[PDB]
């Protein structure tokens, strides 16, 4: 278990207590059937993985000073010459679009319809952490926690840029500058009247 | 089975579950009789193969830059000089018309009225994929799905060019350009109001 998400409320019967990241949070009974819970326990981890990579990419561009996450796919219109660490990339839109359509499918289709695995031991642990003896569930819990926080962070990125038109650091600095005039309410979007 | 096409509906009894490409989709009871259904299964695969070849021919011309699928048989009127990979063809209309009349019937009529076969093992599998051991129906199902998608793609080519006068990529680039003003409602044809 390790958590109750709303104290005093009961835990549902269809959530196993040994499952990593468990709190009992299913107010829709959305994973009630075990096949759907088995599909969603695989897909939450993968959303968390790709969102941790997404928040690291969206923050490292601004911490390294190369624009933001929003304007990084803005060279395909109104010019070109994409960069990475300052190194130029001589690729147009259609070539890298086809390479992302092909070279990712050769790993996605190799992952997905070859089973239902979500923690594959072996080559994906080069250093060696998950020998599944004692520290399996603890590292899985930390991965789930950090990934859920990253999904919340990326949805905050999307809403923050849709409301203010700025980057993550570019308005975290404003919230640190004017803490009472640079929040989600002083814009005329998220709070409709006041 | 592998699919229900409108979930919760009952499957019609005249479709076997072992048949490749199955969903139960027959809302007109159109293939109810077995002698008709066997010929429909034998004809759906061949419509799928010829439409996969049709969509590959309609797309590779524009992806290689040689006009479209529409203007490629437009040298028969107002000029000539047919091309293929840039290589010129010194043939008129009537000679290749008779060659398609004669040389194709030696494959079509040899295929058709020599039985009812639709997956013939032997010379049509040089590398070896369909040994009918474990992965027969899987590859048959993939062939059915890709062929049905190609048939829908070719009818989309027909209606798209009959409504906009443009080719496949010549309007896919526009739908990627103006995604709310370059669809099937902004023309005055498909939606009459």
């Amino acid at each position: 278990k390790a958590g109750n998400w709303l104290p005093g409320s009961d835990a549902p019967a269809w959530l196993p207590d040994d499952l990593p990241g468990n709190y009992g949070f299913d107010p829709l009974s959305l994973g009630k059937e075990p096949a759907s819970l088995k599909r969603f326990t695989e897909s939450e981890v993968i959303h968390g993985r790709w969102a941790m990579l997404g928040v690291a990419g969206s923050l490292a561009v601004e911490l390294l000073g190369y624009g933001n996450w929003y304007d990084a796919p803005l060279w395909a219109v109104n010019g070109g010459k994409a960069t990475w660490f300052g190194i130029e990339v001589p690729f147009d839109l259609n070539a890298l679009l086809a390479f992302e359509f092909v070279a990712m499918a050769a790993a996605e289709g190799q992952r997905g319809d070859a089973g239902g695995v979500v923690y594959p031991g072996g080559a994906f642990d080069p250093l060696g952490f998950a020998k599944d003896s004692s520290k399996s569930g603890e590292l899985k819990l930390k991965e789930i926690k950090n990934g859920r926080l990253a999904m919340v962070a990326f949805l905050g990125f999307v809403a923050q840029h849709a409301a203010t038109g700025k980057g993550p650091i570019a308005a975290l600095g404003e919230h640190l500058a004017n803490p009472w005039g640079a929040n989600f309410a002083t814009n005329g979007i998220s709070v409709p009247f006041f | 089975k592998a699919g229900n096409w409108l979930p919760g509906s009952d499957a019609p009894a005249w479709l076997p579950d072992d048949l490749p490409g199955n969903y139960g989709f027959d809302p007109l009871s159109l293939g109810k009789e077995p002698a008709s259904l066997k010929r429909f299964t034998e004809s759906e695969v061949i419509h799928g193969r010829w439409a996969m070849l049709g969509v590959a021919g309609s797309l590779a011309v524009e992806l290689l830059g040689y006009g479209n699928w529409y203007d490629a048989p437009l040298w028969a009127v107002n000029g000539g000089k047919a091309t293929w990979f840039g290589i010129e063809v010194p043939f008129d209309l009537n000679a290749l018309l008779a060659f398609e009349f004669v040389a194709m019937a030696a494959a079509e009529g040899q295929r058709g009225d020599a039985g009812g076969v639709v997956y013939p093992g032997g010379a049509f599998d040089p590398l070896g994929f369909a040994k009918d051991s474990s992965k027969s129906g899987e590859l048959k199902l993939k062939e059915i799905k890709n062929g049905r998608l190609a048939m829908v793609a070719f009818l989309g080519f027909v209606a798209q060019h009959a409504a906009t006068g443009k080719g496949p990529i010549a309007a896919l680039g526009e739908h990627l350009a103006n995604p709310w003003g370059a669809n099937f409602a902004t023309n005055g044809i498909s939606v009459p109001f």
């Binding site: - | 009871s29 109810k32 009789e33 002698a35 008709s36």
Partner: protein, 74 residues
């Protein structure tokens, strides 16, 4: 009488659509078209009476004869 061609006894009793479309289709007509003269006379009169209306409709709009449709009474 020469081996090639088509036969009236084989084309009729094979054009039968299944699943209760036309019932048994055209099975048994050659025993009744050939043996009946009133059936043959009825089909012949239907064809002649329709292509006579066709002659009438197409000889006024498309007059085939020289200086017809100036002679209005004709």
């Amino acid at each position: 009488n020469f081996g090639i061609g088509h036969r009236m006894q084989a084309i009729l009793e094979a054009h039968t659509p299944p699943s209760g479309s036309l019932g048994a289709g055209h099975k048994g007509l050659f025993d009744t078209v050939n043996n009946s003269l009133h059936f043959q006379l009825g089909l012949a009169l239907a064809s002649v009476g329709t292509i006579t209306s066709l002659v009438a409709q197409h000889m006024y709009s498309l007059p085939p004869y020289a200086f017809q449709a100036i002679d209005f009474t004709t």
